[PDB]
Amino acid sequence: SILDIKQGPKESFRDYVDRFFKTLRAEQCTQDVKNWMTDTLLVQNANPDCKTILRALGPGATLEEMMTACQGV
């Protein structure tokens, strides 16, 4: 269930994003709802450190950018 997908402390943001949207397809609610969820859930459930940077990428940043920001070093 979607509440359970959270980003690992070394899992890169990309692979976490696949898990998330995989799971999200499985659950059955309105497309509308599943979008709301994303909005709450996906950034919030990233590894604590990674959000730090995400926070600084600005609101405008794309996924593409976030995934880049949040792969390792």
Epitope: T52, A56, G58, P59, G60, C70
Partner: antibody
Framework: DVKLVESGGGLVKPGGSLKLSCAAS????????MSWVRQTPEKRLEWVAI????????YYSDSVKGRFTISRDNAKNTLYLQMSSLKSEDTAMYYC???????????????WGQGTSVTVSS | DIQMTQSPASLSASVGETVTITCRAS??????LAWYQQKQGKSPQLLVY???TLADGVPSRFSGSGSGTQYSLKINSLQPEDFGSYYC?????????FGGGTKLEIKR
């Protein structure tokens, strides 16, 4: 009383290497996002690189990507900038900078260092 | 990317006058903009952010205003300590870019 103090500026030859650092006193270091910002001889300011409060995540302006490396020793209350492959064009005052703590996204750079100068020339 | 254009490049006023620097983005920023002050040979100080809100310990003569794509900064009745440089930057998209900067000098 928040402080940022950069150092390590100097003269370096084109395609050389130099490492700037910044000692933060004043606040819980590992609680903030940090940046390096430069100012041209002309005085155009250009944001260069940013880093997670944790440290494991970084991000770079195209203009330095793959040439520069940002890092922090949280225990040493220090932020670093590793420069390699120096263009003459990298000649600037380099400023260490703190992202403000309070907005959902970062809404300002809070504080700045005083800067160290780097001149790259032959 | 989003780009910032400022103007004027420079302007010079007299103590007591009022003055408006502007600032213009290649995209919309929904108010995610900040303004820094730079006095000669010092480093920049944050002065305004989110277009409108003043940083702490910034006298009230400073107002920020704007929305969408054009924003601006205004100083009511100048004091000597206000003369310097002024830069805007945005915080919407990922490269936080800076205005060229508006150089403010004193008339006499």
């Amino acid at each position: 009383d928040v402080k940022l103090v950069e150092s390590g500026g100097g003269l370096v030859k084109p395609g050389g290497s130099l490492k700037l650092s910044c000692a933060a006193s004043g606040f819980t270091f590992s609680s903030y996002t940090m940046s390096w910002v430069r100012q041209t001889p002309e005085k155009r300011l250009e944001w260069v690189a940013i880093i997670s409060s944790g440290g494991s995540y970084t991000y770079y302006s195209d203009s330095v990507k793959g040439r520069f490396t940002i890092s922090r020793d949280n225990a040493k209350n220090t932020l670093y900038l590793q420069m390699s492959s120096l263009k003459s064009e990298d000649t600037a005052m380099y400023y260490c900078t703190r992202d403000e703590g309070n907005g959902n996204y970062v809404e300002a750079m809070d504080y700045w260092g005083q800067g160290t100068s780097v001149t790259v020339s032959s | 990317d989003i780009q910032m254009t400022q103007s004027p490049a420079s302007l010079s006023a007299s103590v007591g006058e009022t003055v408006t620097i502007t600032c213009r983005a290649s995209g919309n920023i929904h108010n995610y903009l900040a303004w820094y002050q730079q006095k000669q040979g010092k480093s920049p100080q944050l002065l305004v952010y989110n277009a409108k809100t003043l940083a702490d310990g910034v006298p009230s003569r400073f107002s920020g205003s704007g929305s969408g794509t054009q924003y601006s900064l205004k100083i009511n009745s100048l004091q000597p300590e206000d003369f310097g440089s002024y830069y805007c930057q945005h915080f919407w998209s990922t490269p936080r870019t800076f205005g060229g900067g508006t150089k403010l000098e004193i008339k006499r």
